[PDB]
Design an enzyme around this catalytic site. Structure first.
Site, PDB file in Angstrom:
ATOM      1  N   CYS A 114       0.828  -1.339   0.068  1.00 57.32           N
ATOM      2  CA  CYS A 114       0.089  -0.098   0.176  1.00 57.32           C
ATOM      3  C   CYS A 114       0.786   1.273  -0.041  1.00 57.32           C
ATOM      4  CB  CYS A 114      -1.080  -0.023   1.346  1.00 57.32           C
ATOM      5  SG  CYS A 114      -0.028   0.034   2.700  1.00 57.32           S
ATOM      6  N   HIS A 170      -1.836 -12.353   5.057  1.00 55.25           N
ATOM      7  CA  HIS A 170      -2.677 -11.589   5.738  1.00 55.25           C
ATOM      8  C   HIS A 170      -4.122 -12.059   6.048  1.00 55.25           C
ATOM      9  CE1 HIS A 170       0.840  -8.789   4.077  1.00 55.25           C
ATOM     10  NE2 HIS A 170       0.804  -8.865   5.482  1.00 55.25           N
TER      11      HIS A 170
HETATM   12  C1  LIG Z   1       2.741   1.096   3.687  1.00 58.07           C
HETATM   13  C2  LIG Z   1       2.681  -0.441   3.624  1.00 58.07           C
HETATM   14  C3  LIG Z   1       1.510  -1.063   3.136  1.00 58.07           C
HETATM   15  C4  LIG Z   1       1.303  -2.259   2.945  1.00 58.07           C
HETATM   16  N1  LIG Z   1       0.256  -3.083   2.092  1.00 58.07           N
HETATM   17  C5  LIG Z   1       0.356  -4.349   1.822  1.00 58.07           C
HETATM   18  C6  LIG Z   1      -0.706  -4.667   0.783  1.00 58.07           C
HETATM   19  O1  LIG Z   1      -1.462  -4.007  -0.045  1.00 58.07           O
HETATM   20  N2  LIG Z   1      -0.331  -5.999   0.083  1.00 58.07           N
HETATM   21  C7  LIG Z   1       0.669  -6.856   0.897  1.00 58.07           C
HETATM   22  O2  LIG Z   1       0.728  -8.028   0.596  1.00 58.07           O
HETATM   23  N3  LIG Z   1       1.377  -6.472   1.811  1.00 58.07           N
HETATM   24  C8  LIG Z   1       1.493  -5.066   2.164  1.00 58.07           C
HETATM   25  N4  LIG Z   1       2.378  -4.703   3.154  1.00 58.07           N
HETATM   26  C9  LIG Z   1       3.386  -5.470   3.686  1.00 58.07           C
HETATM   27  C10 LIG Z   1       4.669  -5.571   2.851  1.00 58.07           C
HETATM   28  O3  LIG Z   1       4.377  -6.108   1.659  1.00 58.07           O
HETATM   29  C11 LIG Z   1       5.767  -6.371   3.558  1.00 58.07           C
HETATM   30  O4  LIG Z   1       5.227  -7.834   3.696  1.00 58.07           O
HETATM   31  C12 LIG Z   1       5.866  -5.660   5.045  1.00 58.07           C
HETATM   32  O5  LIG Z   1       5.993  -4.133   4.784  1.00 58.07           O
HETATM   33  C13 LIG Z   1       7.389  -6.417   5.584  1.00 58.07           C
HETATM   34  O6  LIG Z   1       8.334  -6.512   4.350  1.00 58.07           O
HETATM   35  P1  LIG Z   1       9.587  -5.159   4.816  1.00 58.07           P
HETATM   36  O7  LIG Z   1       9.943  -5.563   6.209  1.00 58.07           O
HETATM   37  O8  LIG Z   1      10.574  -5.179   3.718  1.00 58.07           O
HETATM   38  O9  LIG Z   1       9.012  -3.835   4.670  1.00 58.07           O
HETATM   39  C14 LIG Z   1       2.315  -3.207   3.444  1.00 58.07           C
HETATM   40  C15 LIG Z   1       3.335  -2.501   4.046  1.00 58.07           C
HETATM   41  C16 LIG Z   1       3.632  -1.314   4.056  1.00 58.07           C
HETATM   42  C17 LIG Z   1       4.936  -0.952   4.366  1.00 58.07           C
END
Ligand SMILES: Cc1cc2nc3c(=O)[nH]c(=O)nc-3n(C[C@H](O)[C@H](O)[C@H](O)COP(=O)(O)O)c2cc1C
Ligand SMILES: Cc1cc2nc3c(=O)[nH]c(=O)nc-3n(C[C@H](O)[C@H](O)[C@H](O)COP(=O)(O)O)c2cc1C
Ligand SMILES: Nc1ncnc2c1ncn2[C@@H]1O[C@H](COP(=O)(O)OP(=O)(O)O)[C@@H](O)[C@H]1O
Ligand SMILES: Nc1ncnc2c1ncn2[C@@H]1O[C@H](COP(=O)(O)OP(=O)(O)O)[C@@H](O)[C@H]1O
Ligand code: SF4
Ligand code: SF4
Lengths: 729, 729
Positions: B30, B172
């Site tokens: 997102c 999720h």
């Molecule tokens: C701002 C934001 C919105 C998110 N929305 C989604 C989404 O639409 N779909 C999804 O599969 N994961 C969503 N996540 C989760 C991320 O894909 C990711 O799995 C999570 O942030 C951990 O990864 P990172 O440690 O690299 O941030 C979102 C995370 C963030 C940062």
């Protein structure tokens, strides 16, 4: 047909350079459109114009991006792109001969500015009590002149958009009122201290806006004449009246409210707490000292009440927000004497709740077309007529079933509505007997009246109440062309809840010391002295039962696994509800749930009781240390408010035997309301409305697409702008 | 310049019919854009494509109106209007040689459908544990076929929009995972029971999507391999690996997560709780049983960790969400060996908090251009160079001053940054020393490293730390052309709070038994055994201080007149924060505030203690019965956490002596950050970024307009549709 006593309601009244055609006035109010959903804004206000309302007002309309209410949706008159979107609305209400008004808004620190990221300015630096992480900059004399210029620039764009009335908005504790009110204004310069100084910002803004557009536009102001906090903010017979005297010569019309922003349920009084005319003691104070037309909302739906306040000299104009949402044709029905066609607002505030949640379009419990006028083309008073002779059997006469019956009948179908219950209304008949919710009756009163009236128009249409429960065979062999199953939902009897999605060991409402809402409301099953209400629902049921039970002399403890009465934040009922439970000595155990029940006692635990550290310990074992917080509490009776389930066994049998449908000439059977999935009363009645509007579509079970108001890539919002990515480099 | 060890990171990898140009992958996340903000979506993903990310995915993309996340914002691929808007993004990322992916989403009851008003369907009827008022209809075999078709249709529209990668999203706790997980699935037929029956819905959907578009698109699945709830939901060594083995031949790539929806802070692990690579113990298990490319996020910012998980065989691809938000150019910087230019994510989850709130665009504490790429044309790595030789004095080296210096120096100005502090970073240097917040240092580490670097680019620029406080005379005589005041805020010392806007009688942090956050953090002043923290702030200060003191052996009670740690709901820290406070035996007394303080004791009251009935009793007397809940409680020390105030004394003096600016050749003085108004660190950083970018504008104190992405009345979203009101009559 119109009682000639109501003739006053249709006298015109001059407001400055303008003339109101009659005394029905839609004060400014949110609908979740702003300048972002121009069709919605256009349709919702224009159907009211054709319904006879003298004037239609937008909601609070941001004068500048440092008053941006994101995540909530206001109108905005920032630029030429807004001038064109808002003009769609003024053109369409002008078509039906009504005036259009815009409510110029600057929020101070109450506007969180989550889109713009701009800094809000105020009389003094404060953290908003509404938006508690939002602070403002204290204005210097240049900040003051600049923001006053924001108002003047917006007023001029308002004249460009085609508005007849321009508010400077000082109700709900927004900027002009923040200067007037010492609760915010701690200054010691010419804008602070004395009433004259504290009145100065508003006075100056008024004459500057009047100077800019006063020739072409009526200049109104919306004033919170009493903050209802007692000494310490604005009191009506202290600053309130004196301010009206000071400003009277500048304003063409006074629009009066009470209350602040954190508790604006005092303005939009829920029927739970407030009756029609609740505001009169404060509003009438104004007409005492004003020489200009004043109006003051008070949930007015009844023409006898309307004529009382006009002839008793309390107000000159009837201001309405919610009454106009529930019935856009209220004025036409009064004019024509069709008083029994008036869809009366039940004061539930579910329209407000959608705005407060921030983002979603408004919906209305009474009026299932509100918010739907543009996107799906649903006029509240106009119905496509059938070109065939299809009969429809509706089993269930609750909010959904009775609404589907009503719309179908309006569309010329032949309908047979049946219920085991003796009265139309379904579960709403029990709910309206809860303490405070009596006016929610009007929902089922309206469909009863309408349905009996409509029966006289088709003699093949039948109303069969007090019946024996329909069976699959009964339905199969009934001979209706289409059948609508609206059999409703009930409260869970085994502790099943949104937290576990499983029953709770020991929960059984057939046991003598456990009740459901239905058992409590039927009032037959005996209830002991010490009541515990186990809650996994965030709306009205557990608090309403607690009140009911505590006023009957029980000692009641709510143990709640979810945030108690959370949804009541959005309907604005929360503050008085908590005060009410408090004065009834109702104990609340938040952040707890139940792991097992025995006779006379239950084991509860803190929902944050697990270890905070997550470690991979392999399969078979939780990744956190064990919740160790369990303790038993005793009860005389346990009231289970854990969730609802759809009553769809009839449906399920019918679907099992779908093979037989065609054999019996049944063209289709549809499932609506709580029997499909438990939901808000508003949406239950929507589903009945929708299958009725769409019963000749390919599959009335699933809605057809509605018009979407989202930007088309390639089209700039700014007239003649560049829509593509340009980096400043 | 790049360490040869890091060469693996830049090897291509084949996923189905597609080739990732290197190992850097932005997983779906997102941003508050969806299909509604096509410039934002387009700009934010393509600046990353230009930074060398191999593939860029949308956020969760609704396949149908009955999976509508309003009030939150998802992408949607409902119709041709969406493929036009979303094609804008794929075209732009393709321009830079990257793949574009879309994440097809159906949420079940987790989607509250506040726009569409449609009915969600799932494996069984449940109220969402996330949306507690949202229920679904239990699917039948016809529903199941109908929903699987939604996917097929969305995947074909995706291919039309130019997407290279199509997800079936089962993380999720969304629909595919709901069928697999007994927590939701209470079925009894061939879609319930055994793992074979439970994995049936997902396997079927993957096969149909593959059949539809698998020829043209890589088919991925994002799978929550362990719900981290232990037995009762999905465990990695039980159902997790088995399902992987079952689906392995259908998918081109596994994208792995852990946790659920109510607590997806376990996925997006806050640095407060989790370090880089926290997910590995679960992620490595999928690699054990799969023959396809697997990636698993874990806040990966360090190339050393990146090569570790690849070479150790835990993952093939580096999947990132937040790291890519904080630095769109992380890949290029690693590629070129610019390791010290990497803007490291601090794991504060403020980007998330904005989406959770529902509506607003994303913002980032590290990267002030995130969200601003399209609307204001700010590229994170490219700056307009100045044509003049203007010198800028900046007083304050906190988040705002240091960002203003950094961007100004990048733009070629001569800047003098000064502070009385020994180190760059302002208040963030105290904050990062709170328990768990050590990684928030990266904000000032980054800006320290960059300024030190930029100083060498220009001999006249200057960093002066450990200095005497600047004085109005000092600024006036300094010799800078333009001056930026960035002197911060401090916590209130007199009890001033958002509730009353006034001091609390007896509040004085100079007394030996009252502390502010700064005095606690300095650790010089003595704190007694029993500590009461009086709270009127809804973010991290009170709970973090409570954690700090409790671990040091203090008895801690928080009395809180606001919802404690409310904002931590949105940053996903709240669950584990509440568990932490709980195991530390911190007592929380919510719904109470303080009327007055004495030595060793304070009077507190219930904020709901006023009578619930409002009656006009005339001026001078409150319209409610008096609050009677007041009681005294004792403390040895009282920590005051009631609010912050701008430190703008210098500013005020300079503005008082504005007449002296010109004779001292000072062209302008600007107030930024907390000194203007207390705000989130992210927005303090933004204000500094903004004045720097707009320092040559007519009035750098107030932002210039950004591009708006709102519909223009007259332009239908549906290509070829009608935008005019049309009633179905
Ligand atoms: C701002 C934001 C919105 C998110 N929305 C989604 C989404 O639409 N779909 C999804 O599969 N994961 C969503 N996540 C989760 C991320 O894909 C990711 O799995 C999570 O942030 C951990 O990864 P990172 O440690 O690299 O941030 C979102 C995370 C963030 C940062
Ligand atoms: C859905 C809704 C949103 C509202 N938003 C506004 C608003 O934008 N501006 C304003 O001045 N008042 C707002 N109000 C308050 C109304 O104008 C009015 O004062 C309140 O509804 C009480 O009047 P009633 O009893 O006639 O409904 C809103 C009310 C409703 C029903
Ligand atoms: N088999 C049945 N035959 C007739 N009426 C039924 C049958 N089953 C349920 N009902 C009626 O269906 C109605 C459902 O009402 P309600 O619960 O209010 O649902 P909704 O909110 O969906 O309108 C109730 O009045 C109930 O008595
Ligand atoms: N008169 C002054 N001269 C120099 N530095 C000052 C002066 N007053 C305050 N400062 C510094 O300004 C900095 C403000 O930083 P901070 O509070 O983090 O604000 P922000 O978050 O707005 O960047 C602090 O480091 C403080 O020492
Ligand atoms: S939602 Fe409820 S309060 Fe609002 S207009 Fe409709 S009936 Fe009245
Ligand atoms: S807002 Fe915070 S957690 Fe999110 S990408 Fe930026 S620094 Fe990382």
């Amino acid at each position: 047909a119109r009682d000639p006593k109501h003739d006053i309601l249709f006298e015109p009244i001059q407001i400055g350079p303008k003339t109101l055609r009659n005394r029905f006035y839609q004060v400014p109010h949110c609908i979740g459109a702003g300048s972002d959903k121009p069709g919605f804004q256009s349709a919702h206000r224009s159907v009211k114009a054709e319904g006879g309302w003298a004037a239609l007002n937008t909601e609070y309309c941001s004068i500048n991006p440092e008053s941006d209410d994101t995540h909530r949706l206001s109108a905005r008159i920032w630029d030429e792109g807004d001038v064109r979107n808002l003009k769609a609305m003024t053109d369409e209400v002008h078509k039906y001969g009504a005036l259009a008004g815009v409510e110029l808004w600057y929020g101070g620190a109450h506007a969180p500015n989550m889109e713009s990221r701009a800094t809000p300015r105020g009389p003094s630096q404060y953290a908003s009590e509404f938006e508690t992480l939002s602070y403002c900059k204290e204005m210097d004399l240049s900040d003051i002149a600049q923001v006053q210029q924001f108002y003047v620039d917006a007023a001029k764009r308002s004249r460009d958009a085609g508005f007849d009335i321009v508010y400077v908005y000082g109700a709900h504790s927004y900027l002009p009122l923040q200067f007037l009110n010492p609760y915010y204004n701690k200054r010691t310069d010419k804008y602070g201290g004395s009433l004259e100084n504290r009145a100065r910002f508003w006075l100056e803004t008024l004459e500057k806006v009047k100077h800019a557009v006063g020739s072409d536009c009526a200049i109104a102001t919306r004033f919170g004449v009493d903050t209802v906090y007692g000494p310490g903010q604005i009191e009506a017979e202290v600053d309130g009246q004196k301010f009206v005297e000071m400003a009277d010569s500048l304003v063409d019309m006074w629009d009066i409210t009470i209350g602040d922003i954190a508790e604006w349920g005092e303005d939009a009084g829920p029927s739970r707490f407030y009756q029609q005319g609740h505001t009169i003691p404060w509003v009438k104070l104004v007409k005492q000292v004003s020489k200009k037309p004043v109006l003051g909302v008070g949930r007015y739906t009844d023409p006898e009440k309307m004529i009382e306040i006009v002839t008793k000299g309390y107000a000159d104009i009837i201001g309405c927000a919610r009454p106009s949402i529930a019935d856009p044709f209220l004025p036409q029905k009064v004019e024509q004497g069709r008083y029994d066609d008036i869809r009366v607002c039940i004061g539930c505030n579910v329209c407000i709740s959608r705005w407060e949640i921030g983002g979603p379009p408004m919906i209305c419990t009474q009026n299932a077309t509100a918010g739907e006028e543009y996107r799906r083309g649903w006029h509240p008073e106009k119905f496509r007529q059938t070109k065939n002779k299809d009969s429809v059997l509706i089993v269930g006469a609750g909010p959904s079933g009775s609404e589907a019956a009503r719309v179908l009948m309006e569309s010329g179908y032949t309908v047979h509505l049946t219920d085991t219950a003796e009265k139309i209304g379904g579960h709403l008949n029990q709910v309206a007997a809860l303490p405070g919710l009596g006016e929610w009756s009007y929902h089922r009163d309206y469909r009863e009246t309408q349905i009996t009236k409509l029966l006289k128009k088709n003699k093949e249409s039948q109303l069969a109440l007090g019946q024996k429960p329909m069976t699959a065979d009964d339905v199969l062999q009934y001979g209706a062309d289409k059948v609508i199953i609206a059999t409703g939902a009930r409260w869970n009897t085994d502790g099943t809840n949104c937290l576990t999605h499983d029953p709770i060991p020991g929960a059984d409402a057939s046991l003598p010391d456990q009740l459901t809402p239905e058992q409590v409301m039927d009032g037959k099953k005996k209830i002991g002295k010490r009541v515990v209400i186990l809650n996994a629902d965030t709306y009205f049921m557990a608090p309403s039962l607690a009140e009911k039970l505590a006023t009957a002399g029980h000692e009641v403890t709510i143990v709640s696994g979810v945030h108690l009465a959370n949804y009541m934040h959005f309907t604005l009922e929360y503050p008085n509800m908590m005060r009410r439970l408090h004065e009834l000595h109702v104990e609340e155990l938040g952040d707890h749930f139940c792991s097992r029940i025995e006779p006379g006692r239950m084991e509860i635990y803190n929902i944050w009781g697990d270890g905070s550290k997550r470690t991979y310990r392999g399969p078979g074992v939780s990744p956190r240390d064990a919740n160790t917080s369990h303790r038993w509490i005793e009860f005389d009776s346990l009231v289970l408010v854990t969730g609802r389930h759809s009553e769809c066994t009839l449906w399920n049998e019918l679907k099992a035997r779908e093979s037989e449908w065609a054999e019996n000439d049944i063209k289709g059977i549809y499932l609506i309301g709580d029997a499909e999935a438990p939901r808000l009363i508003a949406d239950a009645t929507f589903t009945g409305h929708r299958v009725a509007r769409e019963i000749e579509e390919a599959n009335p079970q699933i809605a057809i697409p509605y018009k979407r108001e989202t930007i088309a890539w390639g089209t700039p919002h700014m007239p003649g702008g560049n829509f593509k990515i340009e980096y400043k480099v």
